[PDB]
Each structure stands twice: as structure tokens, then as C-alpha cells.
């Protein structure tokens with residue numbers, strides 16, 4: 001009968017939502033698995049807590065397993081999420097006693113890469129699919145981190161070189177907190193049954209081809225595209241939908257840099273000045289210390305009254321959205337994004353052209369993948385002239401006919417890939433089929 005599988009989620013929105021999406025897909029037709037979704041508690045952000053609660057309330061047949069990992073003490077000059085990621089990696093070896101109590105006996109685990117060493121050493125007989133949450137392109141660099149020595153381009157044989165400006169500088173320091181648990185877990189990728197990627201074959205064909213053909217990266221297991229993951233339905237309907245319903249097709253710019261972006265007040269002000277001068281309407285997710293989603297006093301102070309009024313007449317300034325509901329609306333014509341990979345793939349699914357302003361980490365390589373696929377354009381020096389960058393490029397994404405067509409073609413292939421019979425759905429069905 002039906003396989004029982006465990007999905008091991010990590011921490012942070014970007015490392016949570018693809019695991020929720022996978023859990024949801026595997027619990028439903030045509031996969032029809034019994035799914036236990038492991039959640040690391042405590043959670044760090046309220047966004048995480050509400051997303052998880054809402055998920056389990058709307059997926060009653062999915063079983064929740066709370067995996068308690070003590071919060072690490074803060075340390076000066078160490079990022080709190082990196083400290084949390086390290087605590088998860090350090091705790092993964094404790095999973096045997098927790099997974100052994102599950103019934104019926106589990107057939108497989110699908111896990112964040114932070115769990116790799118713990119799962120592949122203490123549960124070596126349990127098939128572990130390491131589900132990376134970044135692009136296939138950046139995953140290859142991460143898997144190569146244990147072999148780094150430099151300020152030269154990194155050339156993984158068989159792949160286009162990685163320029164220095166696209167590699168997080170900490171990757172060259174094995175003692176950096178992030179590099180340390182990247183190295184310790186990448187060293188056990190070879191014991192994973194496969195690497196799953198939230199991507200699709202026609203989106204990263206050169207990378208996937210190299211990895212698979214053998215070799216580049218001899219010792220990796222098969223690297224399997226399973227994206228885009230079919231979207232969740234959300235408990236509460238998106239509050240901006242009736243307004244979006246009133247806008248012409250493809251006339252609204254969606255703007256979001258996510259929870260992990262550190263834009264200063266000066267940068268936010270310049271961005272607002274640029275938007276006020278553009279012709280399109282917008283939805284802009286702006287971070288505010290006030291907890292009430294409706295309190296705009298901080299924005300009024302930041303922009304000043306005249307600018308704020310003009311901005312609020314032309315678009316929506318909000319604290320949070322259901323992103324997939326926004327990107328799925330016919331009124332949204334473009335996406336100014338930091339290119340966090342979940343956001344890239346949600347835009348790919350809907351064929352939404354991207355204006356890429358990457359901030360840190362994998363985002364520059366993600367932006368390059370987006371530009372190479374024809375899904376968007378990457379503004380390499382956005383931070384050196386924010387207002388001008390906005391005025392010139394927003395008009396272009398919103399109207400350029402060639403980019404609109406190439407982005408639409410990405411959307412058609414992305415939809416095809418996750419539909420019944422799609423290349424990604426076929427790959428996932430074959431994984432589940434191999435458990436029966």
C-alpha cells in the first residue's frame with residue numbers, strides 16, 4: 001500500500017515553503033503517500049509560525065512532527081539565522097529515535113541539506129533525498145565548497161565558470177559558520193539517494209546535463225529536478241485581490257525583496273522616488289517595525305507626506321502578501337525581486353518577467369540563471385543608482401515585447417513541467433514509484 005515518507009524542513013521562509021509544498025504534493029493524488037512533516041521548533045519569525053499553523057490546519061491528513069532544537073545563544077557579529085542553521089545541522093544526528101516511533105515504518109526521508117550528515121550517518125539504511133532550495137547552478141557551487149582553495153574564477157569542470165563577484169566571500173573561509181556546516185554536510189551528499197532541486201529541465205539544461213552525464217561532480221548522486229512545486233491553497237484569501245481584479249492585464253509591478261534583505265531607509269526612499277516617477281501601478285512589500293499590517297506611520301515619516309500620498313495613490317504599500325496569489329494574478333506584469341530561488345520559481349511558473357536586484361548569497365547566480373533563461377534582466381549595479389535604475393528598467397520589464405514573450409515561454413514550460421505528465425512530475429512519480 002501507500003508509502004510513509006518524512007519531509008524534514010529547515011528554518012526561514014525560503015527553506016520552509018518548498019518543504020511545505022512538497023509535503024502537500026506527496027500527500028495528494030497522484031502520489032498518495034502518507035506524509036509526516038518534521039518542523040524544527042522553536043521557530044524564529046512570526047511569518048514562519050503563521051505559515052506553518054495555517055498549513056497544518058488546511059492539510060489535516062499530513063502529520064506534524066515537532067523536532068525540538070534549543071535556540072543557540074546570540075553571538076556578536078554572527079548572523080542569528082546562520083546560528084540557527086548550525087544548531088539544526090548539529091542536532092540532525094538525534095533523529096533516529098524520533099523517526100523510529102512513526103508508523104507505518106517510513107520508506108524515505110526528504111530533507112533540507114542541513115540534515116545531511118546526521119541522516120546519512122545515523123540512518124544510513126533509510127533513503128534520504130537531499131532537497132536543496134537553491135538553483136541547480138548555485139547548488140553545484142555549494143557542493144564544490146569543500147574543494148575551494150582564491151580570488152580567481154572558480155571553474156568546476158564541465159560547467160561555466162563562477163566569477164568571483166558571484167561567490168559569497170565566506171565560502172573561501174572554511175571556519176566561517178555558514179561555510180563550516182556547508183562543508184560538513186556536502187561531504188555526505190554522496191550517501192544521499194539523490195539531490196532534488198526546485199527547478200525544471202528546460203530551465204537549467206546545461207547545468208543539469210553536466211551534473212547528470214557524469215561528471216562534473218563524480219560523487220554526487222543523481223540530481224533530480226522536481227519543480228516548480230504545485231502551489232498551496234492559502235487559508236485566508238489575499239487582501240489585495242479585489243483591487244488587482246480592477247487593474248488592466250499586466251499593468252501592476254510587484255516589488256518584494258523578502259524578509260532577509262537589509263535595505264536602508266535611504267535605499268527605500270530612493271526606490272519610492274523611482275516608483276513615483278514610473279507609469280505602472282505597483283504592489284510593494286515594505287518592511288516595517290510596527291506589528292499591525294495597517295499602520296503606515298513609519299512610511300509617512302520615511303517618504304514624507306507628499307511622496308507617501310503620491311505613492312499610496314499609485315500603488316499598494318503592504319507588510320506581507322500571499323506571493324503566489326499576487327504573481328498568479330493576470331494584472332501583475334512584472335516582478336522586481338532579490339531572486340531568492342523560491343520567488344524565481346514562483347515567477348517562472350506564471351511567466352512573470354523579473355527585474356533582478358540580487359542582494360547576497362546565491363542571488364547573483366540566481367539572477368544570472370533568470371537572465372540566461374529569458375525570464376528577466378539583471379541590473380548588476382542597482383545599488384549605485386537606485387532611482388535611475390527603477391525609472392529606466394521598470395518601463396522595460398513592463399512593456400518590452402521580446403522579454404514578455406521569452407518570459408511567457410518560460411511560464412508555459414514551467415507549467416508543463418509540474419502538470420500531469422510533466423518532466424518534473426514524472427521524475428517525482430518515479431521516485432515515489434520506486435518506494436512501492
Ligand SMILES: O=c1ccn([C@@H]2O[C@H](COP(=O)(O)OP(=O)(O)O[C@H]3O[C@H](CO)[C@@H](O)[C@H](O)[C@H]3O)[C@@H](O)[C@H]2O)c(=O)[nH]1
Nearest residue numbers: 013014017133134258260320321322323340341342343361
Ligand atoms: O511577502 C511575502 C514574501 C515571501 N513569501 C513567500 O516566501 C517564500 C520566499 O522565498 P524566497 O524568496 O526564496 O526566500 P528568501 O527567504 O527570501 O530567500 C532565502 O532562501 C532562498 C532559498 O534557499 C535563497 O535563494 C535566498 O538567497 C535566501 O536568502 C516564497 O515561497 C514566497 O512565496 C510570501 O508569501 N510573501
